[PDB]
Structure formats: structure tokens, C-alpha cells
Symmetry: C3
Subunit: 308 residues, 3 copies
């Protein structure tokens, strides 16, 4: 039971930025490039005989067709076991926020297809993860990121979530907390996702908040941020139109509020010539801040993806 797998997707990005300059000016420009969209390669397997138990391992890395890259196992790679009790695994592994993540499936490039600012804390760390099996559509998992920090007060972080799916219907909580980080102190991220996922239709609303203690010097400082996003995919024959909106908020206080708010949106589709082979078309838009000091950006492109 050895398997070699992966996916290759690439194509062109036409992109533009409008940098404001309301106060003290200039507005930069289009960049148009050939870009490998998240391409990558993996090997992996499982063994039995063995028992009710099975051994699982994987090694996956970034394979850029464009070859802007380097390295091994910078993808999700691990070793672990699954059994009556589910899977325990270790090594480079996905954030519990990273594996909700289903509401943000935009094949993308050096500049965001979308929806990014909301997916900023979706990571891979060298860590440990338990994922409990299903019971009545129920699931849960937990993750430790020791690395490493003792040493000082621990920058190890802490990850877990649960997932319900009942009849094409779902919600997923994912959360992260961090005992310490420099250029920060104990930091928290929370996400709930819910929607229908099934039969040629998908819709989801997700909400993430992050509450953070701050300024290890100039205490007590702190910030909160909040983001919403929503996505509707659908399908027929081979085409799969999809759309997403994301509004992040700013925060308050610190002595000053402003509005650090952002809005962004994406639409595009997929045309399956086959299961594996899908043509991709994508157009996003985003705006940071508002008024005289502010920002806008607009991306679009095509791409191919062949999964194997």
C-alpha cells in the first residue's frame, strides 16, 4: 500500500494594485505573470497485519512546475496510526484552522486569488495531532506545537476543533491559542464554519475572531479582529461556478479606533474535462482601509489543474 500522488496546476495571473495617496501619493501597477498555482507532490502509505490497527505515513512537498522552490516535506507530512481510536500522527501537520478551510478553495498565486486575510492563521507546524473517528457525524482533534521555546516562556501553541456533518450539513469549530509569541503574548484564534455541502451545491458562512494581548513592553496593550466570509459553490455537467465574500473588521481602543476594515470578493469557475483535469478561471477584488490613505487590488487569471 504505497501511493504516489499530488496535483499540478498553473497558469496566468493578471493583477493590479491601486495604492492611495489620497494623502502623499502614488498608485502602482499591473503585474502579469505565469504562476504555478499551489502545485505539489506526495508519496505516502499505510500497513496492516498489523491488526485492527494500521500504520500511516506521508511525505508531501511543494513541487513548483515554475520551480521558484526548494526542499522536502514542507507540505503536510507525518507518521502515525489509525485504528478503533482514529488517527494519531506527527511531523509537519496542518493547523486545525487549516483543515476547516473548505470555504476557501481558490487555486491561487503569489498574489491572492482569495480569501486570504481570513485564512492567514491556517498553517503547518511540526507538531502532534489526534483526530477522533466519526460517531453520528461527529469528529474532533487536537494538536500541540511545542517548537520550541524552553528556553523562555513557551511559544508552543495549541490547536483543536470539532466537526459536525449531518445530511450534507456541517459546522466546524477550529481554534488556536498560543502560550507565547514575541512581537505578541498569548494569542487566540477562533473559527466557526457552517453550511450545506453536498450534491452539486455548497454554501458556507464562516466567522473568525482573533483576540490578542500585546506589546510585551508598553503593557497593557491589546487588539481584537474579526472576519466573516461566505462562499457559494455549485455544479453542473462539468462547470462549477463559485463565489466568496470576506469582510474583516478593524478593532477598537489602543487609544485609537480608525477603521482597519477590509472587504474582498472572488468569483470564478472550474470546468472538469474530467475528475482530475479541470480548467480554472478566477477573478478577485480587495480593498484595505478607506478614504485618503487606503488600498485596492484586482486579480484575474486562468489555470489548469490535473490531480493525480
Amino acid at each position: 500500500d504505497v501511493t504516489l500522488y499530488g496535483t499540478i496546476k498553473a497558469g496566468v495571473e493578471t493583477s493590479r494594485s491601486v495604492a492611495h495617496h489620497g494623502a502623499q501619493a502614488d498608485r502602482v501597477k499591473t503585474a502579469t505573470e505565469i504562476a504555478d498555482l499551489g502545485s505539489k507532490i506526495g508519496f505516502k502509505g499505510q500497513e496492516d497485519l498489523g491488526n485492527g490497527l494500521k500504520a500511516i505515513w506521508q511525505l508531501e512537498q511543494k513541487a513548483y512546475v515554475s520551480g521558484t522552490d526548494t526542499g522536502w516535506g514542507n507540505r503536510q507530512s507525518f507518521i502515525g496510526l489509525k485504528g478503533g481510536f482514529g488517527k494519531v500522527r506527527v511531523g509537519r501537520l496542518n493547523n486545525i484552522l487549516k483543515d476547516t478551510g473548505n470555504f476557501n478553495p481558490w487555486e491561487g498565486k503569489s498574489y491572492y486569488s482569495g480569501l486570504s486575510n481570513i485564512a492567514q492563521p491556517e498553517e503547518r507546524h511540526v507538531s502532534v495531532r489526534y483526530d477522533s473517528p466519526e460517531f453520528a457525524g461527529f469528529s474532533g482533534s487536537v494538536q500541540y506545537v511545542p517548537n520550541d521555546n524552553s528556553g523562555k516562556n513557551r511559544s508552543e501553541s495549541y490547536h483543536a476543533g470539532f466537526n459536525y456533518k449531518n445530511d450534507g450539513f456541517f459546522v466546524q469549530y477550529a481554534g488556536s491559542y498560543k502560550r507565547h509569541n514575541y512581537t505578541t503574548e498569548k494569542h487566540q484564534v477562533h473559527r466557526l464554519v457552517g453550511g450545506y455541502d453536498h450534491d452539486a451545491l455548497y454554501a458556507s458562512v464562516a466567522v473568525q475572531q482573533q483576540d490578542a494581548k500585546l506589546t510585551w513592553r508598553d503593557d497593557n496593550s491589546h487588539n481584537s479582529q474579526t472576519e466573516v466570509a461566505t462562499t457559494v459553490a455549485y455544479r453542473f455537467g462539468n462547470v462549477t461556478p463559485r463565489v466568496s465574500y470576506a469582510h474583516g473588521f478593524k478593532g477598537s481602543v489602543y487609544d485609537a479606533d480608525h477603521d482597519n476594515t477590509y472587504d474582498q470578493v472572488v468569483v470564478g469557475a472550474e470546468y472538469d474535462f474530467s475528475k482530475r483535469t479541470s480548467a480554472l478561471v478566477s477573478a478577485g477584488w480587495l480593498q484595505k482601509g478607506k478614504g485618503a490613505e487606503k488600498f485596492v487590488a484586482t486579480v484575474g487569471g486562468v489555470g489548469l489543474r490535473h490531480k493525480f
Copy 2:
């Protein structure tokens, strides 16, 4: 239809340089090393069902048995389609000048087996390529190298060639032009190759010229260069003697033309124990310039190559 493939070739290089010296100067020396000769690995495939169309993808990278290396998809790797209309493909891809290139098949190392100075503009860039199918021995292709440069005046470059083969007979034009480059404004490279390739015999003469505008500070400055090369390979049983000459002429300008001319030559053979497994033996020689300030170099070695 997945495939893993590649080739491994390595072996020893004995090398020497004679650096010419009106003194204050000196003549450097032999270096003798174990060297991986162009060794590398690849995966790739194609899909149908599908249609008259097929999906092609490849990921190939430098695999040094000597491991002086790093990375992924720094070989020719891509994604594209073939069909009635031929192949369109994208990602890291070979120059049109790089895919004539048949006249220079000397497995080589850190220093020049040969024939190098004439193969200097044979590249791989992240780009787009169309290769039209065969009609009556006829073929053609085109390539865009956007990356990236707008930004400023575009350093994107431009590549295409055609190929005729009739009855073990061939000619290949390949050409490159560059809208911009820092230290060469608007630069051009042209190559014609012709010869017999077939049935245990190969002979070819190829000619490349490069005409270049020069902005360095320099307006109006400019240079031309020209290179000829010729190669005769032949075969029996398992041995495949081969030989190559290359004479470049000078960059001609600046009130002393001088002579920047160079001459170089290579001979060696191949002994197939099988299709895949061939023992390689090679000796080159080169000379740059002439007279009191000048250069000479002499290389030779063995190696093995097993293709898979």
C-alpha cells in the same frame, strides 16, 4: 498513465587550463574530480477520456548523485494539452534554441565537455509554448517569456522556431529576441541547424549569430557574434564515436575589433552495454583569444549513464 523516469550519469573529469600571461601573470592548473554529469529525475503523465484531446503534465528536477544540488521543477516541467492541434504547455520550459540542440550531445560537467559557448542561449524559462503537430515532416513552435518586468520596459523575451525532417534529413531554425534586458537592450539570437540524422549516422552543421544593441551607458553601442559548429556521430554494435568543432568569431566594435574569436573541439564515444546503460568517454579542447593575452583549456573523462 503516470510515469517516473530520468537518467543517472556520473564519472571523473580531469581538466587543465592554460591562462596566458604577458606575465604579472600565470598559468593555472589541472583539477581532477568526480562529477555528476547532468543527472536528473522526473515524473509526468497524460490523460484521455477525455477526447481527441489528452492532458499532459511533467515535473522534472536536477538530481545530482553528487548532491551539489537543491530543489524541484528546475528541469523542464509543465502542464498543457495535446490534440489535433498539437501541444500547448506552460511553466519552466525549454528555449526553442535549447530544443534544436541535438548537435551538442556531450554528457558533461562543471567545466565544459563541449560545445558550450555556442549553446549559451539554450535555456529554460517560466513561459508558454505552442508546438504544432507534424505535417509532411514540418513542425513549428513559439514561446513567450513574460517574466516579468512591467514595471519598466519589458525584459520578456520571445522564442520560436521551425523544423523540417525529410528522410533522415533535417534543418531546424530557432530564434530568440528580447524586448529588453539590463545590459542588453533588445537582443537577438538566431540558429540554423541542418544535417543527416538517421540509421547509425549523424552529421550536422549549425550556425548561430547574435546581434545585440548595447545601452550599458553606451548609446549608440552594439555588438554581433557568430558561431559555427559541426558534429559527426556514428554507430556500430555498441560503440558510437562522435566529434564536434565550434568556431566562434569576435564581438566586432570599438575601433579595435581585435579578435575575440574562439576555437574548440570534442571527441569521444559511447559504449552501450544496453540501450539504457552506456559507458561514456570524452575529450575536449578550447582556446579563447590569441597571442600574448589568451586562453587554452583541455578536458577529458569517463562516466556512466543509465537512463530510466
Copy 3:
């Protein structure tokens, strides 16, 4: 006859150091981390038809599940041939001292599982190796490490050993000499290993000495070191207890000998769920020097290893 193979092993390391101090100094601390234990990936093969001869090639590289890594063929990778006469092979290849090495099979991490200081000269160099076939349990091999050094007086090194195995019984001499090194003029390393290896029991004693000329200013300067180690492994059902001791002696010369001596030991086991899948447990201890300026360290951990 192509083969993809490798092994994945990872897990946790709890570690501690006691650094001895009149102070300026102090006694440092535990570090506890998830660590990929020597994990890695390879491809390779052989061909015939061919003859009594066969072609062998391999490309193996470090694959860290933890992905602290980079690169290709930094493992043992080569090309060569085997036949009546045995194997000649080239490329990145294992030191003759490296392939005795059977007495030190502790899956390990960034800090030593064990037994390290004795395995310090077990290497891979870009080089050439002949390994003669078996005759009456007899074997031999020789290695040249040219790279590269002429240039100056040659830092190429020199490697060979022999191996006897008769009825679960063995001894292996491995030796290394180096014509030059900056940090060693003309350096030598010798190892004998002997023991029973067979049928669920393994025991070995090995001895290494290294005699070295020292050029720095110092002529004539020089040092000798000596190290002993011993290992007992055994097996039942699926568990495989093992233990190892290593005592190095000092460099002794130059009017003050001191004692640069060190002692270290390791114990732990393996539990095969299968041939491939083994759970690993390990505890080592080491001490450098003695007295008021000195050192101690203690490591322990678990890990999984799945070979493929």
C-alpha cells in the same frame, strides 16, 4: 527493475544538559522537541541483458517529515556495476568506517541518541568504491575521495576495509587515511569490530583509534585518540532490547595530558508490530571530561519507524 524505497521515523526527544561550572557558567537545560529521526527517501535500480554483469544506480536523499531540510542525493547515491567481480560504484558514497557501523543502530536526533563520538568519522563523500564479492565469508572494499585539492597538497582521502563473517560471527576492519586536511595534516582512523550477529542475538565490541599529525603552527604537533564501544541487541516476539557503552580516551601528549576522556551509554528497545513498523524507545547518557570543568547529558524519547 526500478525501486522506490526509504524509511520514515519520527517522534519526541526530551533532553537535558549539565554544563559544569566554576560558573562563567552555569548548567543549561532540558529541551523537548518533535524530531524526525534520520528519515529519508530513495529510488534506485539495476539492469541485465546485459550479461553476467548488471547495472546498478541509486538516488537517495534526506526526507524530513519535520522538513528542516533541503536537497537531493545527499544520501548515499551512485552509479556502478556488479558482476563476477562485484560492485564498482561512484558518486556520494559511504565511508568504509560508515558501513561497519552495525554496532550503533540507534535511531536518533539533533542531539545524540548514541553512540556518536565514536561514529564521528562515518561519512559520505563524492568518491569511488570497489567492493569485492564474498569468498568463504570474506569481503573487501576500497574508496577514493579525490575532492579535490590540486591545487595544494591533496586533501583527498583514502578508505578501505575487509569483512569476515563466519556462522553468525564477524569482524570488520575499516580504515581511513587522509593525505591532507587543513585542521589535520595526514590523518588516520582505524576500526575493528567483532561479535556475534545472528538469530535474535547480537553482540559486538568495536575499537577505533585515530592518530593525527597537527600542522597549525605547532610543528611537530600531534594527537591520538581511542574509543571503545560495545553493543548487545536481542530479540523476542516483537521486542528487541539493546544497549551500548562507549568509552573514549583523551588526546595525550605535549607536557599536559589532562583527561579528555568521555563515557556514554544507551539503552532502549524496539517493538515490531511488523517487519516494517517498529515503535522505538531510547535513553542515552554521556559525560565529557571530569571534575570542576566538565559535562554531562541525558536524552530519552519515543518514535515510530515505518520502512518501505
